[PDB]
Structure formats: C-alpha cells, structure tokens
Amino acid sequence: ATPADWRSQSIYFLLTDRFARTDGSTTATCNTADQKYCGGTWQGIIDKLDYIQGMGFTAIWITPVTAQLPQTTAYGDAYHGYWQQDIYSLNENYGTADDLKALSSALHERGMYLMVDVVANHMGYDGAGSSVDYSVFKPFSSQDYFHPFCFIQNYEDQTQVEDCWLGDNTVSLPDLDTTKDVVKNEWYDWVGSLVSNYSIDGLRIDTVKHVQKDFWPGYNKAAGVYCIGEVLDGDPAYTCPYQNVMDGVLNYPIYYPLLNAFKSTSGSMDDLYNMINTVKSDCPDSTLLGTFVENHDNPRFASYTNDIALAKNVAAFIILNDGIPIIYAGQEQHYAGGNDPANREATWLSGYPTDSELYKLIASANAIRNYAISKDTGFVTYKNWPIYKDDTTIAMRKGTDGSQIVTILSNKGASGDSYTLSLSGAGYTAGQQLTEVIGCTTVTVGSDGNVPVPMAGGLPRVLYPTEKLAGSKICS
Ligand SMILES: *[C@@H]1[C@@H](O)[C@H](CO)[C@@H](O[C@H]2O[C@H](CO)[C@@H](O)[C@H](O)[C@H]2O)[C@H](O)[C@H]1O
Ligand SMILES: *[C@@H]1O[C@H](CO)[C@@H](O)[C@H](O)[C@H]1NC(C)=O
Ligand SMILES: [Ca+2]
C-alpha cells in the first residue's frame, strides 16, 4: 500500500513473542527480566484480531520475521527479532511461512494492513566482534560484506554512526557495508521478495540513521510499499531530512515533548506546541510521520505516572495528531514497565479486557478519527493546528472547515478541578452543536464564536459537529 493509502491508518505495534500464544493462555509465565522467548506466535495474533480491531486500529506493526542467532546470550534470546542471521528463513519460534501468510490474509479479510519490521543495518552474533564466524550469516557469509569491527563512540561523527557497529562485546551486531553494490543489490532483491511473498502492506525500517542516506531510496523503491524509518533522534533538523530518502519517519521529535507535557501535572505545553509547529513547517510531510509516546525502546508512559487521566490525554493526542497513530501493545492496559527488558511485557497476562479505561478511550478516539476520515477526504492532509495553550492545556484543530475535530487536552490529571474554558479559534459558527465524543456530552458554540468547553477530571475533550454524526454509531 502507498504512502497516500497509509495516511488514514492507525497502527497497533506488537512484539510477536509477547502478544499472543497459539494456546491462547492468559496465565503463561513471561518474566521480562529472563529475556527469553515467552512463546507468542503469528497464529496467536490471528486469534486476537477482534481485540485489536475493537480499539479501531486499521493495521498492525509486528517485530522482525527473519531467523535469528540461536543462543540464549548473556542478554537472553533473540525474542525481539533484531539479531538476525539467515534472512531467507523465518524465525520458527513464531510459526511457519504459511502462518505468516495466514496472518497477512486474516488482516486483509478484515480490511486491515500488515506492517513488518525490518533491519538492513546489521546481523546479530553471540559474542565479541573478534569471535564472529561470518559464515553463519545468510546470504552475507563473509567478512567482505561487513564494515571493519569498531563501536560507535562519537555520536556527533555521522560517518562513525554509519560505519561502526551497534551492540557491545557481549552481543555484537555486525554492521553490513551498505556502501557496497553487492549488499545494496541483495537487500533490494530481498525486501521486494519479502513484501511479495507475504503480501506485506508497509514496512517499519529499523536503525535508519546507522545506514548512509544513499542506501534508502533504492530500498524504499524495491519494497514497493510505504516505509516508515526509525531515526532515533529528537532533533527535527537531524531526523526530518530522512524523509527526503524514505516515505516517513517515526516522530521522535514530537515524542520527547509529548511525553514531558503529559507525564506530569507540571509538564511543558509550550514545548509540545512549539514542536508541533516546528515539525509542521520544517519536516517534508508531517502527515506521513508516525506519532507515539510508548515503544519497546523507552520506559512506558505509566512508568512515569499511573495517573489514568494523563494516560487518556496522551493516547488522544497520538490518535488525533498529524500522521499515523501508533500505540504499543500494553499501553491500552496501562502497562508500566521501565527500560528494556521491563517494557516487553506479555499482552496476554492482562487477560485482554475490552472494558479497561484505556481500551475504551482508544476505541472512542479511533472511532471519531475513522469516522471523520470516512466523511472528509481532506482530514489526513489538513496540517494539525494548535490553537490554544496555557500552563495545563493544549487545544488543536484538524480537518476540513465545517467537519473539523477540535481537541482540548489537559495535564491537570485525575484530581483536576471543574471549570469552563472559553476557547477561541475553533472555527465553528455560533449556535453550532458539538458532541464531545469521549464522554458523549454536547456543547454549543456561543454568539461570539467561542466554545464553552467544560473541563473536569483532567479529561481530554474531542469535539465534532453533532449534525455531522448523523448515521454514525458514535455516542449512539
Ligand atoms: C531497532 C534496532 O536497531 C535495535 C538494535 O538491534 C533494537 O534493539 C535490540 O537490540 C539491542 C542490542 O542488542 C537489545 O538490547 C534490545 O533488547 C533489542 O530490542 C531495537 O529494539 C529496534 O527498535
Ligand atoms: C520469496 O519466494 C521466492 C520464490 O520461492 C524466493 O525466490 C525468495 O527467496 C523468497 N523471498 C523471501 C524473502 O523469503
Ligand atoms: Ca551501519
């Protein structure tokens, strides 16, 4: 599926090892500190697609599928998929080629997309750089395919970031020499054939900043689908230029101020407001970026705060911001693990309840986004507009005039006071009825064009015209 096809999607990102077992157990042990395979499978995912689609997601992002190093290293198993050795075999832990094709097919029967995580930068190996038997790598079965062994120490030296190895002396990540035509050609043939064999709709490309930029256009073109890159840097002047060589990047620029704004009742709404406007103006296309606050590479949101109002606001932001929302499996069950491995919790141990506070919130926010998109072909290309901020509030507007979603978010938290915010700049006409689609109350635009937004409980407010909800299942 094309970048234009992907703008309307909403992604549930999961670890294949951690989301769902074939046996469907909600009690099978998964000690994150052990760093071992817990037994999640592609078939497990298929069996729980009602759970995912019930939140209004249109797509899943699964961790990498290639065969990995076999060892239980000092840092555990390759359960995450980022330590590949044989790119023409699948990780048998997750099932067979038929199981991966059945997951793609199951998603397509429900009108959903499959996005697969891929790594071009490196292989994995149990042991120090000097101990590497390059013959285990398929097809790159020679040192001649790799950059000489060295570690990245000077992160300001982009040449060293690209040419030296990730990992350490315990688990090394041998660095492919992506400047070699033979390596480019092998990767380009591989990615096009992966996409073809498994009917993959889009890719999340790992580790993008660690491969020189000239590699990426050929890789994105060979894939033949929308590619979103992991460029792990919060500076939009570093990260957004990657969108000149790849369709999208993960929105790490928004990540840091989004987390800071909502993780505390003292968070900066100014930094978030400012970064929305910087990305809007200075990134090649904010509507092809992926918005997130939680992943397997940072502490979960609820590790910073267990306040559920704060968690609802940040989830609403992720859904309603420019670009593709991305929610990480467990976020909807308020998982609070810290850094790796604590943030790789098994989703099945929640019992997959569809009545949890954040399952309901995410379902409500996805519902109005999916509905608005279905009625407004301009929604996904209207650049999100922050219209208001104060110490505890940010309001933003997105969508075609007359059909815009106006979202008011708060960091007051669950013991927030009750008050009326008089909101200017929403663009609705006087006397217009609006539905607040999270709590299903109505607000009327005043004679002056200001919206009297009832604030309470630190709750997020998501406004849409009542007249435009005719025939929808929203708020009845
Ligand atoms: C992107 C990817 O570049 C990362 C490096 O492989 C990956 O981290 C994985 O490998 C490291 C280093 O061996 C482990 O400590 C992590 O547990 C594992 O996930 C990122 O997760 C991936 O997003
Ligand atoms: C896809 O299947 C084709 C035809 O059997 C094979 O040549 C190719 O290596 C496979 N690609 C992947 C990535 O498995
Ligand atoms: Ca590299």
Largest sheet: 8 strands, parallel
Taken together, the total number of domains comes to: 2
What is the CA–CA distance across the termini?
33 Å
Outline type:
globular
CATH fold name of the largest domain, please? Answer: TIM Barrel
CATH class of the largest domain: Alpha Beta
- Report the bound ligands by name, code or SMILES: ligand 5QP, 2-acetamido-2-deoxy-beta-D-glucopyranose, calcium ion
Determine the CATH superfamily of the largest domain: Glycosidases
Query: What percentage of amino acids are in beta strands?
Result: 15-25%
Task: Please state the structural category.
Answer: alpha/beta
Structure overview:
With 476 residues, this protein is of the alpha/beta class. Helices cover 27% and strands 19% of the residues. It folds into 2 domains: 1-374, Glycosidases (TIM Barrel, Alpha-Beta Barrel); 375-476, Immunoglobulin-like. The protein contains 14 helices and 21 strands. An 8-stranded parallel beta sheet has the order 11-10-9-5-2-1-13-12. It has a 6-stranded antiparallel beta sheet with strand order 14-15-16-21-18-19, with helices on one face. The longest helix is centred in the last third of the chain and has 19 residues, at 357-375. The protein is globular, with a radius of gyration of 22 Å. Bound molecules: the ligand *[C@@H]1[C@@H](O)[C@H](CO)[C@@H](O[C@H]2O[C@H](CO)[C@@H](O)[C@H](O)[C@H]2O)[C@H](O)[C@H]1O, 2-acetamido-2-deoxy-beta-D-glucopyranose and calcium ion. The ligand *[C@@H]1[C@@H](O)[C@H](CO)[C@@H](O[C@H]2O[C@H](CO)[C@@H](O)[C@H](O)[C@H]2O)[C@H](O)[C@H]1O binds at residues 80, 82, 166-167, 171, 173, 206-207, 230, 296-297, 340.
